[PDB]
């Protein structure tokens, strides 16, 4: 029934993949409230849809800045993928549109804030806590990879916690639909697989390595490979010597040695049994995979929420007025968005 659910999901995906939704809303339909994050091309804001009163998160991207940093194709990947997928732990795109200056993606507002914020504040998660999150990523990646999708930026910063304490993956700027191999040097230093660092040509297995990094970081409170400069992080990653905190259970340690495996013939998620090597590992014995999917498992943590449109689970960022030029910028580059 896994294989069955996955064949149906693929059919659904491909219809949207081959005929993407375009221009399904407009800027004046939304009141902009507050910035929930930024990057070099723009920001994600809390907005209110005026015709329904619903709250959303709206990603705004400056077309000229995207072009200047040569991320046109990656940006087109993000929107095309996000509009096509459908999974409980993938943030849901509601609308997208563009104007003379900017690109816009309006997705579900996930009010519990980033995993990153809670993880840093609390210090670390217990094994059951980390396992509950890990299970959701395992299933999400099973779904994405079945669609030939590689995510390529797994990290607590990109995992938003919803009202029920479940995860929603965000920020698909490096997600790509690929059969066989790809070569872009992209990702976050702490989470890069050795094969990326070594310009090797790589596949979906880099997502399974990143899962090992995430699980370690959630359970230890810090990642397996860190240093003050990225070059020193890369040196640690290629050497591959991981040390585990004394409080890690031997099952956890065993899982992580199989995920953080430099050898692709040995790395879990990449063997003959695929994701089942992970799902059936002993660290995951208490996990009911169908209950996770159905969100029937009780979350070990649920964030405080004081009304719709409240942002206390988010950091504060400098605000900036949206400006729409009277001349169309980069029309050709983004025609398909």
């Amino acid at each position: 029934s896994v294989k069955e659910f996955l064949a149906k999901a693929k059919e659904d995906f491909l219809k949207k993949w081959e005929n993407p939704a375009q221009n399904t809303a407009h800027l004046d339909q939304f009141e902009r409230i507050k910035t929930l994050g930024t990057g070099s091309f723009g920001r994600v804001m809390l907005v209110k849809h005026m015709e329904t009163g619903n709250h959303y998160a709206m990603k705004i991207l400056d077309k000229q800045k995207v072009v200047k940093l040569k991320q046109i194709e990656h940006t087109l990947n993000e929107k095309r993928i996000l509009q096509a997928v459908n999974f409980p732990f993938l943030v849901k795109l509601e609308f997208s549109f563009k104007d003379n200056s900017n690109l816009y993606m309006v997705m579900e507002y996930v009010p519990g804030g980033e995993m990153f914020s809670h993880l840093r504040r609390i210090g670390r998660f217990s094994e059951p806590h980390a396992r509950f999150y890990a299970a959701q990523i395992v299933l999400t990646f099973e779904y994405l990879h079945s669609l030939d999708l590689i995510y390529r930026d797994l990290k607590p910063e990109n995992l938003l916690i919803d009202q029920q304490g479940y995860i929603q993956v965000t920020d698909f700027g490096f997600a790509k639909r690929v059969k066989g191999r790809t070569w872009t040097l992209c990702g976050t230093p702490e989470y890069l697989a050795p094969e990326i660092i070594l310009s090797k040509g790589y596949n979906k297995a880099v997502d399974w390595w990143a899962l090992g990094v995430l699980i370690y970081e959630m359970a230890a409170g810090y990642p397996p490979f860190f240093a003050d400069q990225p070059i020193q992080i890369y040196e640690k990653i290629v050497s591959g010597k991981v040390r585990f905190p004394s409080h890690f259970s031997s099952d956890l340690k065993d899982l992580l040695r199989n995920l953080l495996q430099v050898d692709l013939t040995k790395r879990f998620g990449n063997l003959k049994n695929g994701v089942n090597d992970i799902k059936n590992h002993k660290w995951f014995a208490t996990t009911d995979w169908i209950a996770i999917y159905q969100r029937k498992v009780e979350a070990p943590f649920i964030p405080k929420f004081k009304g719709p449109g409240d942002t206390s689970n988010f950091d504060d960022y400098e605000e900036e007025e949206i400006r729409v030029s009277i001349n169309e910028k980069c029309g050709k580059e983004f025609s398909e968005f």
Binding site: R120, D153, G173, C186, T188, P189, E190, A220, G221, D228
Partner: peptide
């Protein structure tokens, strides 16, 4: 401790993906 080394590092804030 490793924890102390991490907290004193420049890598405890929100981490950016890389570019070239």
């Amino acid at each position: 401790t490793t924890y102390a080394d991490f907290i004193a590092s420049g890598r405890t804030g929100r981490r950016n993906a890389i570019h070239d």
